[PDB]
Amino acid sequence: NVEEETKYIELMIVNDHLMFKKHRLSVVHTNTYAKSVVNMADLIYKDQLKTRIVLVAMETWATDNKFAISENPLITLREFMKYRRDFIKEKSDAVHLFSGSQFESSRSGAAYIGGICSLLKGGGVNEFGKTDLMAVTLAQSLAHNIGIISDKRKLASGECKCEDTWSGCIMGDTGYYLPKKFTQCNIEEYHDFLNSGGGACLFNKPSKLLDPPECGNGFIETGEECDCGTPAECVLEGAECCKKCTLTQDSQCSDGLCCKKCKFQPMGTVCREAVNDCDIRETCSGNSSQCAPNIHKMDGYSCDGVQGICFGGRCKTRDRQCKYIWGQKVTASDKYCYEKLNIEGTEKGNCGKDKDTWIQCNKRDVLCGYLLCTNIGNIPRLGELDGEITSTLGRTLNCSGGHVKLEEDVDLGYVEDGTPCGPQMMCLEHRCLPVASFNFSTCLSSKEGTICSGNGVCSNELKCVCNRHWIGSDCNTYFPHN
Amino acid sequence: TQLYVIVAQLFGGSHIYKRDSFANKFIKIQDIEILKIRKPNDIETFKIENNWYFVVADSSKAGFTTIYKWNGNGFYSHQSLHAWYRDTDVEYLEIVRTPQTLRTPHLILSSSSQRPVIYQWNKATQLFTNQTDIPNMEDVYAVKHFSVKGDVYICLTRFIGDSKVMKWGGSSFQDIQAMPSRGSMVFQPLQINNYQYAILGSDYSFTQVYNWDAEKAKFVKFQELNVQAPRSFTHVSINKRNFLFASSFKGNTQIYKHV
Amino acid sequence: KCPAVCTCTKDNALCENARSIPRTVPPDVISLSFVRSGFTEISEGSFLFTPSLQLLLFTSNSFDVISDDAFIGLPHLEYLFIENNNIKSISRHTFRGLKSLIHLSLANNNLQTLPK
């Protein structure tokens, strides 16, 4: 399935001048050092995650640091990410900073949780360290970016623990003696993230790498007509397709799901079933060995008739917010709490985060104020509590809320932006606002007030993907075919 | 006459067991704090000014190196020393500094990719203060000292990088000799039968035995042993016999009677 | 697998003494260790089995004849070490195919000449 498919995370490394000076000002040494670290992290990820981290590019500042460098991991991470947004433009799934400034914190590297495949969130910062040390830090940070984090609630409950009890696991504080195995909850979080639609940009094979043309490296690069890998593992997959980076008499493929038994599969086959309603099934082009590019519902499309919205391919509901923030057993409360707590109250219902004078929420809409769920546990899966978890009690409901934080300034305790409040009514700056606030673009439509001429759904690339037997770009002409 | 053994585990924290001189049973005298002590790497114990202090370092960077009293105290009871950095190994020694006339206690804190730190047991602060750096190189793994004719000679050991045996001189050390590292995660000096030897491990060679040359003042190749993954060396002398234990991380610990 | 004559362990091919080139090396090992080699001819490409290998030692040998492009097939090899190997002469085209090599050592090998 989609999980079993080989993910390809396009990573680019940004390097500051501190470790450049520490490496005797050598460009080539830093380049090969980054290549070795990338290879080591890929070897880590290949055992379980089945994900190859392709070092698409790397930048090292031989001159000096462009922006302010501080020992605070959060401030330095923000500066690196804003520098990436301002200057870095090349397509890359993850943008990771090797921080020469060794952070004065207790955590090795600072990476956003579930932030991969994002312009302002796709990557993290890894501090200076030993080759293995920063390789482990990069592995932890990339696990963070793909939503793989140590589960605090399961740690307290003992639901899942590190099977490498010798020296702990990678997700925890980086001990000197590195382990070799990830926990099963790491992989479970990976399936949950991929099924949610996150990390959809990791399914592309780059054609250009920092590595010279190497036969059997697992990627069809420049100068290689086909690549089935080393013949040791080529027997299982693509045995007759490609041999020694060369075709076997009459052939059309090397690997890939869209090409079964080294031959082209029939047209219309689904090489990737949609994970949810936010995902769009991918069909092979009929002449491309690799599966179709990942396409999801455009940002603003609802998971259901009214409730829920797909952002970046990930569904968002109040119930989904409670599940991500608090836990699976925790579900969003009814409108009763929303209209009985957000209207007036301290620490119970608040629109904006103001400890002194809490922001009042109007009765027109109360679905963007304090996030209220049902049966909130002792501790959330991720984040921290700003004080104590708020608890509030003809129908009786167990009403609860909190102020779950994160490594970013954004507060997960409130309702995340874009959560629906009604018809085209979704959160923006802790308030229900229409689509005009977000200024969502209109896809290729021919009628009035429709999407892709009514029948058809626009993908994430703002391009229409018409339905069956609709070859027109704007879903206007019918072309029967067999 | 009450043994307080420090039983430290990478999981579940550490404990201090008390061995009764009568029942010979090890009862946990002090459950040491586990909030900072999670993955211990090395513990160094010493007594000074009739105060028993032991140094704790965590293989994880979160757990900071700290010195604790024999009974057992909290996070930073009397001093903090090295924190927010790497904590790998610590070694206690006694060297004569330039300012102080008498013998002055010190600690050496070696850390991965971090400069080793000298710590003077300053009596004015009564703490292991004066965090400084040796002028030799970066990323030294292990450290241990000894005294040859009053002059202190100490080991600055790296796993692959050429390790050093270097002489103390009052403010910093003065270089004496350098020897190759071929898988020596440890290099421990010893004094057996009044003979100054030193053992460098070899994860990727035959472990090497140096004897202090009484004439060249340099550690010449004395002998070559073969031990599975050496990690530490510890010597005993009972009656008229001497024995040495060579630890083994990936196999059986070796034992050699010094004859 | 793990040769009996060698002292190979779980995580290494710790060969104490090999009569000649061991071609029976599995991809399980991550490093090599040769000491007091008896054969005098450095063979050619005898580790065309695992490019992921990184380390090997040559200690106190007599490799009077050494293959050009010696031990080819290790582009990822970076720990190239020869010590005490008393060698009459070295083939000119011996150091090729090693594009990711960081550390070298030619110790106590008693060479009087080196080619261009």
Numbering used by the authors:
A (entry chain C): 233 to 625, 630 to 718
B (entry chain D): 293 to 551
C (entry chain B): 41 to 156
Direct quotes from the study:
LGI1 is a 60 kDa secreted neuronal protein that consists of the N-terminal leucine-rich repeat (LRR) domain and the C-terminal epitempin-repeat (EPTP) domain. Meanwhile, the S473L mutation of LGI1 causes epileptiform seizures due to reduced binding to ADAM22, which is a member of the A disintegrin and metalloproteinase (ADAM) family and acts as a receptor for LGI1 in neurons without protease activity. The ectodomain (ECD) of ADAM22 consists of a metalloprotease-like domain, a disintegrin domain, a cysteine-rich domain, and an EGF-like domain. As such, the LGI1–ADAM22 complex maintains normal nerve signal transduction through the interaction network, including synaptic ion channels.
LGI1EPTP interacts with the metalloprotease-like domain of ADAM22 to form the LGI1EPTP–ADAM22ECD complex, while the LRR domain of one LGI1 molecule interacts with the EPTP domain of the neighboring LGI1, thereby bridging three distant ADAM22 molecules in the 3:3 complex. Like the crystal structure of the 2:2 LGI1–ADAM22ECD complex, the LRR and EPTP domains of LGI1 are linked by a two-residue linker (Ile222–Ile223) in an extended conformation. When the three assembled LGI1–ADAM22ECD complexes were superposed with the LGI1EPTP–ADAM22ECD structure as the reference, all three LGI1 LRR domains were oriented differently. Although the triangular shape observed in the 2D class-averaged image suggested (pseudo-)C3 symmetry of the 3:3 complex, the determined structure of the 3:3 complex was not symmetric. We then analyzed the interdomain motion of the three LGI1 domains (assigned to chains B, D, and F in the deposited PDB file) in the 3:3 LGI1–ADAM22ECD complex by the DynDom server (Veevers and Hayward, 2019). On the other hand, the density of the disintegrin, cysteine-rich, and EGF-like domains after Pro445 of ADAM22 is relatively weak in all three molecules. Using three orthogonal principal modes, the 3D VA indicated two twisting motions and one stretching motion of the triangular-shaped 3:3 LGI1–ADAM22ECD complex (Animation 3–5). This analysis also visualized relatively large motions of the disintegrin, cysteine-rich, and EGF-like domains of ADAM22 (Animation 3–5), suggestive of intrinsic conformational flexibilities of these domains, likely resulting in lower local resolution in the periphery of the complex.
